[PDB]
Design a binder for this molecule. Structure first.
Ligand SMILES: C=C1/C(=C\C=C2/CCC[C@]3(C)[C@@H]([C@H](C)c4ccc(C(C)(C)O)o4)CC[C@@H]23)C[C@@H](O)C[C@@H]1O
Length: 254
């Protein structure tokens, strides 16, 4: 069972992606006080009527997601080969993957301590009850939490985490892509880097079938993407919803 060494180029790709992530993911969440403030209405009963009437957490979470899409755009532009694509394909890939990369990158704030995304004091701790206060339902939230725990338990090296985000973005099977072959060539270069990295740098037993497990998470993300889109559609029917979102969020999901 051969373990070819990482090529000079593969090492450079990993370094570039690590740098890109470090430049676009602030692990202190220090910008979050700039978003519209979180508001949490009394909704212990999980009333859909109340949740939609108030959408109390939506301005804050929409601002968080919008900010994150901006960061993902920056990250993607640093992926080796991404700028070889036409502008048209670049935008198709970004719009189609945005929610998935947000779900992946959020794993860094997710904690199994209490099953929350913890981004600071209580104000910026996001629980399932906060997501329902933004107008989403359990059909999305429950599998989202299951996804976060499963990803956590893979214990990815940061190298593997950034590669997975890059592979997710540069996917040739997204609707509307023009040069699928070029996209696939870029993705293959990243996939080969990841497979090679795992085999020579990830110790047992966590390395066992790890590449296959990571590829399965990409398939899981497709499912969550589809469910999020259905739910965003519903959310959009609420009068005055657009003011609680942002122009970038409206474009990406509308
Ligand atoms: C973003 C990041 C973070 C959390 C992501 C969360 C927690 C709150 C609920 C969110 C935002 C989920 C929620 C279902 C969601 C995603 C997009 C939307 C809207 C409200 C736009 O429909 O709602 C998806 C990702 C979830 C915090 C930090 O890790 C940065 C990361 O980019």
């Amino acid at each position: 069972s051969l373990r070819p060494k990482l090529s000079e180029e593969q090492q450079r790709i990993i370094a570039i992606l690590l740098d890109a992530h470090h430049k676009t993911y602030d692990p202190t969440y220090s910008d979050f006080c700039q978003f519209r403030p979180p508001v949490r209405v009394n909704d212990g009963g999980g009333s859909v009527t109340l949740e939609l009437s108030q959408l109390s957490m939506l301005p804050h979470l929409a601002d968080l997601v919008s900010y994150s899409i901006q960061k993902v755009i920056g990250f993607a532009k640093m992926i080796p080969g991404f700028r070889d694509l036409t502008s048209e394909d670049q935008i198709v890939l970004l719009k189609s993957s945005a929610i998935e990369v947000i779900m992946l990158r959020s794993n860094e704030s997710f904690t199994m301590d209490d099953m929350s995304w913890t981004c600071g004091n209580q104000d910026y701790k996001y629980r399932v009850s906060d997501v329902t206060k933004a107008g989403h339902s359990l059909e999305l939230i429950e599998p989202l939490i299951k996804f976060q725990v499963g990803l956590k338990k893979l214990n990815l090296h940061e190298e593997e985490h950034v590669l997975l985000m890059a592979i997710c973005i540069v996917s040739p099977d997204r609707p509307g892509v023009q040069d699928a072959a070029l996209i696939e060539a870029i993705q293959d270069r990243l996939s080969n880097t990841l497979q090679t990295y795992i085999r020579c740098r990830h110790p047992p037993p966590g390395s066992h079938l790890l590449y296959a497990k990571m590829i399965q998470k990409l398939a899981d993300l497709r499912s969550l993407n589809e469910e999020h889109s259905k739910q965003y559609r519903c959310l959009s029917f609420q009068p005055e919803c657009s003011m609680k979102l942002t122009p970038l969020v409206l474009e990406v999901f509308g």
